[PDB]
Amino acid sequence: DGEELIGDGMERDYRAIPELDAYEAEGLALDDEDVEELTASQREAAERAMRQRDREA
Amino acid sequence: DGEELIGDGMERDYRAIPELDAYEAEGLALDDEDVEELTASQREAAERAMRQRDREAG
Amino acid sequence: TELLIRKLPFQRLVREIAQDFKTDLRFQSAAIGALQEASEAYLVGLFEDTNLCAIHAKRVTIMPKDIQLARRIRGERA
Amino acid sequence: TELLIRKLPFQRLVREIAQDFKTDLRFQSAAIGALQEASEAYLVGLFEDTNLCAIHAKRVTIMPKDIQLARRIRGER
Amino acid sequence: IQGITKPAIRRLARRGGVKRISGLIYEETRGVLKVFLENVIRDAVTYTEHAKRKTVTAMDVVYALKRQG
Amino acid sequence: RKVLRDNIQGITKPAIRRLARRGGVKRISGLIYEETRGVLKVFLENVIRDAVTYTEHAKRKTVTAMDVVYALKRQGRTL
């Protein structure tokens, strides 16, 4: 039928795996960057474009 | 148990009834109507008021 | 013109409901029409999802619990 | 409690998916985190709904058709 | 309520692909419709009060419908 | 050696179990795992495609958390 989720040995699913438990630095943009967010017009433009592509699909 | 929607006699549900098949006139726009749509000021005022209305409830 | 709810009973329902919120009201018939179009669309969709639930439980007969589930999953449940 | 998805695998998954959109992308840590929170919330809610479906069918074991029905009704595909 | 007739509800259910119904479906459906209409109309009427007229319009309704979601 | 960290692919089966447990599920079919992975992918694809797009209109190659927030707000559900 299936697997019982609550029962003997469930603690196995709750352990720490140190090597998997933190983000790595590859791909990460950090840190001191002054990067700033969308303005309202940049946002509105993007959302306009996304409405568009949604229409085309 | 249940009730069948498809079977002998269902034509009953599909009858045209002219008296009931049109909106009566009481009461509706006079159609002599000079009427104005919503200025975005009033639209935003409305939606703000309704947002507040909702907040005080859930 | 596909028959679902008859015009007159519907118009009277709308007016009756509205008479609570505001006294002495008028409606553009196009407004009533928009309400009717929307109401019937809503109920038809609701019934489609309800049906899905019944079928999921291996019933051909739909029940209030089917409606309640569908509405729950759509997140209407208030 | 309090662990759901592991950070590294998730990060990897996000980067791998983001490739096909835009090459040489970079993510703020906060952004990966945001996606992980959102994803965990999404799946947990979806399992709540899935479970409602299984219960409706008189089952304790949830199945793919339970998920599928839930997503169908929510209008996802 | 109560102008929503049993035949109306059957017509709707049929249109939604339903082949058979429990007896309690009718009441449920009425309940549901009621809530829906109470919501939308409330919003619509508010749009009308702000417009400062006693006449509800198709646009008021469209906005009220938009507002649901 | 980190053979583990290098060979991990997608989200793990015990994660899925933790998730289902959080959603109050009791027993799962074996087919659930694959289904869930599929469902997750579609979800992420949909958010990220938006997030990335937001980023393009910000004139940067770095995706911020606010881009993701706006992306999620587009799909609704929730913040």
From Swiss-Prot, chain B:
Residues where Phosphoserine is found: S41
Cellular compartments annotated: Nucleus; Chromosome
Domain of life: Eukaryota
Region of interest (Interaction with DNJC9), residue spans: 1-58
Effect of S41A: Reduces phosphorylation by ATR
Note: Early fractionation of eukaryotic MCM proteins yielded a variety of dimeric, trimeric and tetrameric complexes with unclear biological significance. Specifically a MCM467 subcomplex is shown to have in vitro helicase activity which is inhibited by the MCM2 subunit. The MCM2-7 hexamer is the proposed physiological active complex.
Disease: Deafness, autosomal dominant, 70: A form of non-syndromic sensorineural hearing loss. Sensorineural deafness results from damage to the neural receptors of the inner ear, the nerve pathways to the brain, or the area of the brain that receives sound information. DFNA70 is characterized by slowly progressive, postlingual hearing impairment.
Family (UniProt): Belongs to the MCM family.
Protein name listed in UniProt: DNA replication licensing factor MCM2
Annotated organism of origin: Homo sapiens
Gene giving rise to this polypeptide: MCM2
Residues shown, of full length: 68 to 125 of 904
UniProtKB/Swiss-Prot annotation, chain C:
Coiled-coil parts of chain: none
Keyword set, alphabetical order: Acetylation, ADP-ribosylation, Chromosome, Citrullination, Disease variant, DNA-binding, Hydroxylation, Intellectual disability, Lipoprotein, Methylation, Nucleosome core, Nucleus, Phosphoprotein, Ubl conjugation
Gene Ontology CC: Barr body; chromosome, telomeric region; extracellular exosome; extracellular region; inner kinetochore; nucleoplasm; nucleosome; nucleus
Effect of D24H: In BRYLIB1; uncertain significance
List of residues that carry Phosphothreonine: T23, T50
Impact upon substituting I55V: In BRYLIB1; uncertain significance
UniProt-reported outcome of changing M63I: In BRYLIB1; decreased protein abundance
Subcellular location field: Nucleus; Chromosome
Domain of life of the native organism: Eukaryota
Post-translational modification (record): Acetylation is generally linked to gene activation. Acetylation at Lys-65 (H3K122ac) by EP300/p300 plays a central role in chromatin structure: localizes at the surface of the histone octamer and stimulates transcription, possibly by promoting nucleosome instability. H3R2me2a is present at the 3' of genes regardless of their transcription state and is enriched on inactive promoters, while it is absent on active promoters.
N6-(beta-hydroxybutyryl)lysine: residues bearing it: K22, K65
Modified-residue entries (N6-glutaryllysine), positions: K22, K58, K65
Residue positions where Phosphoserine is found in the record: S29
N6-succinyllysine found at: K22, K65
GO BP: cell population proliferation; embryo implantation; male gonad development; multicellular organism growth; muscle cell differentiation; negative regulation of chromosome condensation; nucleosome assembly; nucleus organization
Family: Belongs to the histone H3 family.
Protein name: Histone H3.3
Protein species of origin: Homo sapiens
Swiss-Prot record, chain D:
Molecular functions per Gene Ontology: nucleosomal DNA binding; protein heterodimerization activity; RNA polymerase II cis-regulatory region sequence-specific DNA binding; RNA polymerase II core promoter sequence-specific DNA binding; structural constituent of chromatin
Chain positions found as N6,N6,N6-trimethyllysine: K22
Residues with the N6-(2-hydroxyisobutyryl)lysine modification: K7, K22, K65
Main location: nucleus
Disulphide bond pairs: none
Keywords of the record: Acetylation, ADP-ribosylation, Chromosome, Citrullination, Disease variant, DNA-binding, Hydroxylation, Intellectual disability, Lipoprotein, Methylation, Nucleosome core, Nucleus, Phosphoprotein, Ubl conjugation
Outcome recorded upon mutating D20N: In BRYLIB1; uncertain significance
UniProt modified residues of type Phosphoserine: S29
Phenotypic consequence of I55V: In BRYLIB1; uncertain significance
Modified residues (Phosphothreonine): T23, T50
Entry comment on modification after translation: Acetylation is generally linked to gene activation. Acetylation at Lys-65 (H3K122ac) by EP300/p300 plays a central role in chromatin structure: localizes at the surface of the histone octamer and stimulates transcription, possibly by promoting nucleosome instability. H3R2me2a is present at the 3' of genes regardless of their transcription state and is enriched on inactive promoters, while it is absent on active promoters.
GO cellular component, one term: nucleoplasm
Modified-residue entries (N6-glutaryllysine), positions: K22, K58, K65
Effect of V60L: In BRYLIB1; uncertain significance
Outcome of mutating R71C: In BRYLIB1; uncertain significance
Modified residue annotations for N6-(beta-hydroxybutyryl)lysine: K22, K65
Modified residues (N6-acetyllysine): K22, K58, K65
Cell compartments where the protein resides: Nucleus; Chromosome
Result, substituting L4R: In BRYLIB1; uncertain significance
Residue(s) carrying N6-succinyllysine: K22, K65
Keyword Lipoprotein on entry: yes
Protein family (similarity comment): Belongs to the histone H3 family.
Name of the protein: Histone H3.3
Classification lineage: Eukaryota, Metazoa, Chordata, Craniata, Vertebrata
Gene, per the UniProt record: H3-3A
UniProtKB/Swiss-Prot annotation, chain F:
Phenotype upon changing L19P: In TEBIVANED3; results in early developmental defects when expressed in zebrafish embryos
Residues with the Phosphotyrosine modification: Y33, Y70
Positions of post-translational N6-lactoyllysine modification: K13, K59, K73
Keywords noted in UniProt: Acetylation, Chromosomal rearrangement, Chromosome, Citrullination, Disease variant, DNA-binding, Hydroxylation, Intellectual disability, Isopeptide bond, Methylation, Nucleosome core, Nucleus, Phosphoprotein, Ubl conjugation
Effect of H57R: In TEBIVANED4; results in severe early developmental defects when expressed in zebrafish embryos
Cross-link Glycyl lysine isopeptide (Lys-Gly) (interchain with G-Cter in SUMO2) mapped to chain: K2, K13, K41, K61, K73
Record annotation: effect of changing G76R: Found in a patient with a neurodevelopmental disorder; uncertain significance
UniProt crosslink position (Glycyl lysine isopeptide (Lys-Gly) (interchain with G-Cter in UFM1)): K13
Modified residues (N6-succinyllysine): K13, K59, K61, K73
Residues modified as N6-(2-hydroxyisobutyryl)lysine: K13, K26, K41, K59, K61, K73
Residues recorded with modification N6-(beta-hydroxybutyryl)lysine: K13, K59, K73
Record PTM Phosphothreonine, positions in chain: T62
PTM sites of type N6-propionyllysine: K13, K26, K59, K61, K73
Illness association: Tessadori-Bicknell-Van Haaften neurodevelopmental syndrome 1: An autosomal dominant disorder with onset in infancy, characterized by poor overall growth, microcephaly, hypotonia, profound global developmental delay, impaired intellectual development, poor or absent speech, and characteristic dysmorphic facial features, including hypertelorism and abnormal nose. Other variable neurologic and systemic features may also occur.
Family that this chain belongs to: Belongs to the histone H4 family.
Name the record gives this protein: Histone H4
Organism: Homo sapiens
Organism phylogeny: Eukaryota, Metazoa, Chordata, Craniata, Vertebrata
Shown part of the complete sequence: 20 to 98 of 103
